[PDB]
Design a protein around this ligand. Sequence first.
Ligand SMILES: Nc1ncnc2c1ncn2[C@@H]1O[C@H](COP(=O)(O)OP(=O)(O)OP(=O)(O)O)[C@@H](O)[C@H]1O
Ligand SMILES: Nc1ncnc2c1ncn2[C@@H]1O[C@H](COP(=O)(O)OP(=O)(O)OP(=O)(O)O)[C@@H](O)[C@H]1O
Ligand SMILES: Nc1ncnc2c1ncn2[C@@H]1O[C@H](COP(=O)(O)OP(=O)(O)O)[C@@H](O)[C@H]1O
Ligand SMILES: Nc1ncnc2c1ncn2[C@@H]1O[C@H](COP(=O)(O)OP(=O)(O)O)[C@@H](O)[C@H]1O
Lengths: 100, 1585, 200
Amino acid sequence: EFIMNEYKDRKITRTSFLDDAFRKNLESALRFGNPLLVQDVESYDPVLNPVLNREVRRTGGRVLITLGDQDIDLSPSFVIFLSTRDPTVEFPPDLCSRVT
Amino acid sequence: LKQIREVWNTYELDLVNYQNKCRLIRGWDDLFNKVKEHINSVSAMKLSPYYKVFEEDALSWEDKLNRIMALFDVWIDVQRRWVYLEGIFTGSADIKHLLPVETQRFQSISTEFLALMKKVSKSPLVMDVLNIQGVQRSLERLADLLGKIQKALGEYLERERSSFPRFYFVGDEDLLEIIGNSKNVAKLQKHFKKMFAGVSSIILNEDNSVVLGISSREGEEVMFKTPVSITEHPKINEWLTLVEKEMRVTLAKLLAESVTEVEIFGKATSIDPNTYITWIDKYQAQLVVLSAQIAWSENVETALSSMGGGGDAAPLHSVLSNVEVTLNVLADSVLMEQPPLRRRKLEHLITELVHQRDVTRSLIKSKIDNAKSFEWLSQMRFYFDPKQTDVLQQLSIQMANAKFNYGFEYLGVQDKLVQTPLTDRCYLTMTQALEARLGGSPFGPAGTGKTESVKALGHQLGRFVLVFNCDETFDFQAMGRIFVGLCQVGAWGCFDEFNRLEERMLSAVSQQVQCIQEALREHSNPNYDKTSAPITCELLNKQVKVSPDMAIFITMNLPDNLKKLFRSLAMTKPDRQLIAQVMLYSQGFRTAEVLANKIVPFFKLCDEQLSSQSHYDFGLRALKSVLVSAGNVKRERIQKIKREIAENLPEQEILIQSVCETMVPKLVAEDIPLLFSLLSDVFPGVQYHRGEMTALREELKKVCQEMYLTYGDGEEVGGMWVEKVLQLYQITQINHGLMMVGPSGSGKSMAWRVLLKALERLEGVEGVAHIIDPKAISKDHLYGTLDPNTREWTDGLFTHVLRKIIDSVRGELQKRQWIVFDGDVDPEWVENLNSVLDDNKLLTLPNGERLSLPPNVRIMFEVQDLKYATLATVSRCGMVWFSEDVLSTDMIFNNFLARLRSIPLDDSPMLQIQRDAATIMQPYFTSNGLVTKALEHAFQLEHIMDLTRLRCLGSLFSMLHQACRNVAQYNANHPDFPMQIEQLERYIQRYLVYAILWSLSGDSRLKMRAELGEYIRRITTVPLPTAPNIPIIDYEVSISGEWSPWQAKVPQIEVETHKVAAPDVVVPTLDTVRHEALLYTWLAEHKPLVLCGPPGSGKTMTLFSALRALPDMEVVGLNFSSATTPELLLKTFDHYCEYRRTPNGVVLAPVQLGKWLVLFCDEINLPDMDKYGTQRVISFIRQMVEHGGFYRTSDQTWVKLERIQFVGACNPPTDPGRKPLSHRFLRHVPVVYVDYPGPASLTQIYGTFNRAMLRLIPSLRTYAEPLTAAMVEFYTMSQERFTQDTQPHYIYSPREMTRWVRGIFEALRPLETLPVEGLIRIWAHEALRLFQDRLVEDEERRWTDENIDTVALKHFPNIDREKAMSRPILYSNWLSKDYIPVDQEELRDYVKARLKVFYEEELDVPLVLFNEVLDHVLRIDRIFRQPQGHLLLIGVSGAGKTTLSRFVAWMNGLSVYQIKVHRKYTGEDFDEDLRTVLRRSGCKNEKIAFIMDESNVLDSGFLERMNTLLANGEVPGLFEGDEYATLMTQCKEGAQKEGLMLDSHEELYKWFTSQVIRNLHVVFTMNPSPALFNRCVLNWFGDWS
Amino acid sequence: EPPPGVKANMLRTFSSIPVSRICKSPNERARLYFLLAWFHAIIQERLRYAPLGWSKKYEFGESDLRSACDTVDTWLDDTAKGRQNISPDKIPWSALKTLMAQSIYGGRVDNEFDQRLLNTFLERLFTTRSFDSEFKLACKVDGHKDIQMPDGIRREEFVQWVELLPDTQTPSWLGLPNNAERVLLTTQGVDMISKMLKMQ
Ligand SMILES: Nc1ncnc2c1ncn2[C@@H]1O[C@H](COP(=O)(O)OP(=O)(O)OP(=O)(O)O)[C@@H](O)[C@H]1O
Ligand SMILES: Nc1ncnc2c1ncn2[C@@H]1O[C@H](COP(=O)(O)OP(=O)(O)OP(=O)(O)O)[C@@H](O)[C@H]1O
Ligand SMILES: Nc1ncnc2c1ncn2[C@@H]1O[C@H](COP(=O)(O)OP(=O)(O)O)[C@@H](O)[C@H]1O
Ligand SMILES: Nc1ncnc2c1ncn2[C@@H]1O[C@H](COP(=O)(O)OP(=O)(O)O)[C@@H](O)[C@H]1O
């Protein structure tokens, strides 16, 4: 709720990895350039690794990110927040290294 | 949008034919999933800001897509509704009278729907029908009308069900068939079983217009007093109600007449048995027991009323004496032969008279005179008053203070329970609960008599009792309507075990039961005792009226919802002694009390002294079955003694004979002496004698003689097996559905085959069996399928066999049919066979057609351990246990020798040579001196797999057969001077020893082979090999008959320089040639085998080159992944084999005539076991190997394999993902432990390669031997230490030496004039990059460096004092044109500059070049230079593995390709990506770097795909049909662009594989499978220092 | 928690049953209800001493008491159709004993020995000798003392007798030995040690 109230002016959208529309929500948030809060990070979705790795290609004035096949313009100020609700979990080193 | 627009111009509706000769749509998956994918794609592309390519086309295409979605979403529902309602309105008759308004409405709707279907048929294009105006509106209107008419049908069906309340017990389709098939009353006759209590059929007139009466399953028949005629009552509900009323009335009148008639018998004494028997026959068993109960209750009541004043001449003693004389008459009557129905009535009368006797004798003789005393009031009392006009009020049953009536519902004849004190208190408690309007909830251990006691109480009161079994038999969709029926008919409900239901089902059913119980108890309100408005509860959103007769019973083993509404009784310990005493007394047994007192503790001991197996059942049901069998045996002996009263037969002998005849077959070998010791304890000095069955034994002996098997009688060889066959015969006689269970390696199949032959020869009835493997075939294909749209029935395999047997074509009853189920039993498929195994003998297909198997058919199962079988399936059928001790070893030897002496190997000279060989080897097999001792020694040794006697012996037998074939060939080559007898003896003895060596403990390490050889040396007198310092396993038996070493037959080969370490080049060596000869030995006998060994030990190449070595073998390489299913083998047959029906049966043979197909199975143990511990593909291959064929699913026909044979290879079962193979399959396939090649073998096979590559430069040709010695010794040293225990990736195999040789050859390939120090330095560099970078500790690395220097010094001392050239030992190709060694500094500067430009042009985060990064870059560059260089980057995440890999790939120009992975990433997507990279690597010449992360591996199947792609170089199971044709075209084009002539697919595919070998490097980045550890160069990319 | 004690249980049971149901019919029905309440209290506070007592912790609860009261009502109404003071001998003692031993309270019992104990209670209490003024509900209570039987014709006398029960409820009230409290206290102390131990 702190994150929601802090980023309400930027219209932060609340979602989770369990949601089936997570990829569509990710694409929409990344296209418009607004913050995303993804809870339930227990079942981390490997499609988000290019976002976490910040693999960005400044090519031809088209900043783009490799999400699957269709690469989408990486709008500035796209902050994604990952969150969970339990305190006992052993995150894989792939995810642990890419986040604070 | 290009791919999206082009694919929508080619879709077809995929029309199919319907049973009404109409058109339907198939392929909803292809027509919805791809549409949703296109919707997602267009939404994503219009979402992404890169939409300045197409703007209006996307929106137009999206609205089209939504149009397709809406149209087909409505269309599928409309089609389903129309097909269902068309079936309902056409198959069912009398619909014209059954609501014709809906008939006409459906006619109009079907007319419109068929017009639309014609419109679609004329235009089968998807967008053509969309463009037709009015399609969507008409389709939606059709959907609405179909919904309305389906609602009307449901409401009519509910109205009809409410009209006759017993219709609530049957489903919707059954009720539809009942109300439709009014003319065909025979269709209702099968549904009469569910609706009513005991009646199974109603008796009609000759013209089927008047219901004369009813009947039952057993044969009991009741004539209606006033028959009802369907003529003036045409409606089904009306005349069924009349039948129910007339049935009540008829039972009432017949009971009144029976009571009046039994007053005559009960007046005093001196009852005449003839008139008593006539009375028993006249009236039904229900009414007979009712009459006895009423007479006894009234007589005792009058006796007590007379006794009320005091000791008034004791008429109660007269009542007891009358009961005694009646019971004596009954006991005399059961001894004489009676009809089965009269027998059942007589046993019911005996048990009830015993209860009546005991009551008065014990509880009432203790000075009770008052008729109102509780000691008399506690007993269940019957008061009959025929004066009352109402049928349901005449008889009243009163227990304690409760006053029930008798629902006059016909129960047929149901087995009664003896009124034990536990049963008496059960009756008391349940009646007290029912009087207080509370359901009864008995609890206790299962099998104690709760459900049976509740059902017996319900039948005593005449109520119809429903029993709902708990395990997998609940249909919650029907539970509500069943409750409504119970409420509206006044029936009973008894849940078999309420706590077995899971939480949701238990909660829902408990809520329904709570509502029912509150409704029921509202009938007894203190202020609302008089019910004006009938009590209605809420079920199915309607107010269902509650009848006071209704009751609900549950049995625990209790929910909080029902604690306050249900009374509980504990029935933990039933009275087995009294039950046995009464049943034995009712069976005519004298002194039955002693027999019960002995038998009950005996069954208690058997649950305690004996072992614990699932198939054992010593409960009360088994005891009762033993008792009835003992009664049958006693009557049979009485009849036999008569034909040559007689109350002198020993009863204990009969009892133990019944016990043994029933229970011995189920016993294991260890339990038989325990059972007989227990019998000697409980039944001392009493003997059990087996049935002689001499008539069957002679035929058994003849069949065994003609089948080469061993027959015995009792104690000699074969006695246990023939006894098991006789037990199988007795179980076949007693019941149907029996299963044969025992460890694999017993004579199960031989037993039933021999018994079938004996039955055919003795009885003259022809017996043909139908062996079905149910695990290999799909269950949906085993029983059948209904297509969702057409709903057409395609029968399954078992269903087709049963229908062929039932249909009147051939041998319906003149032939005995045995459906043998070979394999493993589990709930999945035995769910359907449960209805066939029980007394129902019915198979209910989901089409609705019921199939009842004829009496001749027996449903046989042969399994191995019976551990995934439901208790329901085991209890429903008898069984015999085939212990492993049954099939003795000497009888297997006798069978082998007889078969060898009789059957020609080349189906007279062969017969003579075989007979001579058998005469020679007789003193070894049959005598327990050599082969038995060696067998037990091999069993007490350890092998790579579990040792099964039959496998270890079958390999031996096949090897001896090959020895005979070798002698025959020796005779063929030399016509003059053939094999003499002395040479024959010597050769056969030595080859027998050699075959024991290779079969026994032939799948173990060299040490255990040496131990077996030493043991044989101790226990034989045959001439052993001369040298005592060389193991016997190395020697070979030459055709001359003398031990010749295998090394002398090892040749020398000179492989060409450009073929060094090639994909498929095998250089002969000791192990290679020895395994090749053994492999040929098992190849000749068409015997499948599996080569098992550590990874990269030379299993695939040895077998694979051996398979092309023979000229008549055509090899097929199949890879068994975890997801491997039998459809893989079906596809292989479909592509490489053809089906022909010209022989007596269908035969499967390869297309290439005169060629023996071999299907090599890579990783045969890899396929995963299902959740019941069986591998589908392994069971399928076992079916093919053993029975020589399988069943086609298309037409359910057995097809025999011709010129088809299987061979496999696998890692040991201890490795990850290696499930052990089944013993049944294992006994068919011998296995060879392909261990790592020895120092000498490696030395030879790699000195060959050293000489081959060093021939390129003549100056270095002298250096091959020291180079090979150095490589081999350093590899051995690096193998002894750094084992798998320290680090899981410290695996050493001879594939690393292959990489060593290939890397050195690649380095020397463009180079010339290399001095000796150059060879040593490149050798040391490859040693570092193959044996040191894999290490984890600096101490290990320095040890590797020191020993590399040590071995380089030792094997050649003429090298300069420089170690290799300097300390770093660096190599680079950028600084020069060739792979010239480089120094540190300028290499570092070049790498710094190129990394700087790398991250200024491609990356955005600067990189530093520290020493570790430079070394790892050099390693990855060396790997990319080498074709099929695959790297294993092991290290912490985020340490630069991927970044360095991409950096060096850009530096070398390799295109980088990696998998864009997501959560829903699937197998076919990964296979498509593999296809893409393989196309870009083989075709369209392009070096590709395949960077795959550990997280990129989501399924083990991806890992198996990588394993088959890395070592082999291609994926055989990757290219199917259209894609195969496209890549063949592309390879042809690319080859002609490279100017190469391939033409043949075989050769063009070979070129593609070579190009992929050259143009594909896979880099695997892993954070800290042994198979994956090999075939990749390991690089310990440690954490930053 | 329900307050431990025979007096508290008997007071609760007496308050639960309406006075109209206990005071109608022959005037003995009050004493029959008192005997039923005492039996229920004895068998329900013996349940606390699970090892020494009801070998298994049974579930004798309010439903069993309601069923037993209904049984008493039905059988006393059937035996005494009128409203006169029925004779002590004419009480259906055997009917009540059997229905309470086999049904109602005996439905929960599993083994033969707690069934035997229930039978012992039922024959010791539900009998015609309970009518005599010098009837001992429990003998050797603390050795010298013996719990007597209140002579009452209506609910009020029995309720007052319950309220004058002594505070000291030694385990000999239930027939158990006086040192059964020592075993229970030892078990509770061990339980407290275990509970403290698990809080680490
Ligand atoms: N007298 C004999 N009776 C039965 N089998 C014999 C006899 N002598 C030798 N044998 C051999 O013993 C084996 C018996 O196994 P059988 O084929 O009957 O079993 P299965 O049901 O096919 O399989 P498994 O028992 O492994 O589950 C066969 O190889 C058979 O040739
Ligand atoms: N006798 C031999 N002649 C030639 N090469 C051999 C020999 N024995 C082993 N090799 C080498 O060892 C490796 C074994 O190859 P292959 O992949 O076929 O082994 P495998 O034991 O079947 O492997 P896996 O368990 O992975 O299926 C190859 O590099 C091969 O060149
Ligand atoms: N008192 C009894 N008299 C005769 N047979 C009994 C008696 N009690 C149980 N049985 C037998 O025990 C068998 C199994 O009883 P079942 O109803 O399965 O008990 P449960 O309710 O524990 O499942 C039945 O075949 C039944 O005939
Ligand atoms: N030697 C290095 N010097 C500086 N940065 C590095 C180095 N190695 C890796 N990185 C940084 O690590 C990031 C990504 O690491 P990555 O290659 O994904 O590691 P891994 O392959 O172990 O997951 C890159 O942004 C890169 O800047």
